[PDB]
């Protein structure tokens, strides 16, 4: 199956006093494995998954050094972008960065990507070919021209197509007991009387991994969206995820309705019926 | 440039009285990232509450998970209190064990 | 491992 390694960075300027708050997190698929918090006491990149603790002190030195350099770059960028947008020094502003790479079912490079944002809006994004940037406005246009004219412009592409893939493969092998294990959803249906003539059927999917899942209601074999409710997928806290979908049906007609569950861990989709 | 947080209050495992469990408050879809989240037991803030590391979704909106170990009973009532720049008053969402 | 050559905006 497909796999991904992604890094998320958030820098929030702190007018009034001090340096911006900087938080970085690293994911392999839906598993967080590293973090960095400027407000934490260690001032080190920290493990958040057991399989990354196998790495020696040289890895943690390298990751701490590079993540600190990234934080400094984002702090500089916060001041530069404040100047770009003619904003006052009194307000707080936020820069967000996500980049990563995907390997396909063939365990070879499939995709690379990087997106940068300012104050919750698109700023600049790498194109699919990894050879040029897309700028949302004129300030980002300035950044785009500077980056594309630079001698070291190629470095990010070389990272996404190469180094990123090699580290992802290494992480997948080291943490294969969990990273390459799919947890199929544990499903059940509940029934709640809403009135003398109507009832609510709720289809539960619990403790599944990865997060991607599709829950659908069908009436007599036809997809139904009316009179349904669908909560956002949420984390259980133990690394797995939860979701449910509900439908309001006439009392006595519950057998007409089926809940259909699609997930990576199911060889065939599940069908639940009351 | 300001999106209000969606809130879900739920248990990690099916709730049974007298059985240890985990109470979760999942806040998502908000911007900016500064937020205040408390878990309340009968209106009292729970001190030993942990939270996940800050991340964001495709639309740049942030999400956080706050959680605490807890043992549900029939009388104890649990809730999540969230304050954000988009909220005039703190939003309190009560835990519904069926959601 | 993270990227180590981000350029300033």
Numbering used by the authors:
A (entry chain A): 1 to 274
B (entry chain B): 1 to 99
C (entry chain C): 1 to 9
Recite the paper's sentences.
We identified and substituted 9 and 14 residues from HLA-A*11:01 and C*07:02 within the A*02:01 groove to generate the HLA-A*11:01-A*02:01 and C*07:02-A*02:01 chimeras, respectively. To experimentally validate the designed chimeric HLAs, we refolded HLA-A*11:01-A*02:01 and C*07:02-A02:01 with the HLA-A*11:01-specific HIV-1 RT and HLA-C*07:02-specific RYR peptides, respectively. In both cases we were able to purify recombinant pMHC-I complexes by SEC and further DSF analysis revealed melting temperatures characteristic of properly conformed peptide-bound molecules (Tm=51.8°C for A*11:01-A*02:01/HIV-1 RT and 49.8°C for C*07:02-A*02:01/RYR). The best crystal diffracted to a 2.02 Å resolution and had clear electron density for the HIV-1 RT peptide, which we modeled in the F0-Fc electron density map. Overlay of the HIV-1 RT peptide from the wild-type HLA-A*11:01 versus the chimeric pMHC-I complex, revealed that both peptides adopted an identical backbone conformation with a deviation of 0.543 Å in RMSD values. Additionally, we observed that while the B-pocket was occupied by Ile2 which was principally stabilized through hydrogen bonds with the peptide main chain, the F-pocket was occupied by Lys9 projecting directly into the HLA groove. The observed accommodation of Lys9 into the F-pocket was the result of two salt bridge interactions between the Lys side chain and the introduced HLA-A*11:01 groove-specific residues Asp74 and Asp116. These residues appeared to orient and stabilize the Lys9 side chain within the groove, while the main chain was further stabilized by hydrogen bonds with the HLA-A*11:01-specific Asp74 and A*02:01-specific Tyr84, Thr143, Lys146, and Trp147. Interestingly, the introduced mutations Gln70 and Arg114 were responsible for forming multiple hydrogen bonds with Ser6 of the peptide within the C/D-pocket. Taken together, our HLA-A*11:01-A*02:01 structure revealed that the newly introduced peptide antigen adopted an identical conformation to that seen in the wild-type, parental HLA-A*11:01 structure, further validating our fixed-backbone design approach.
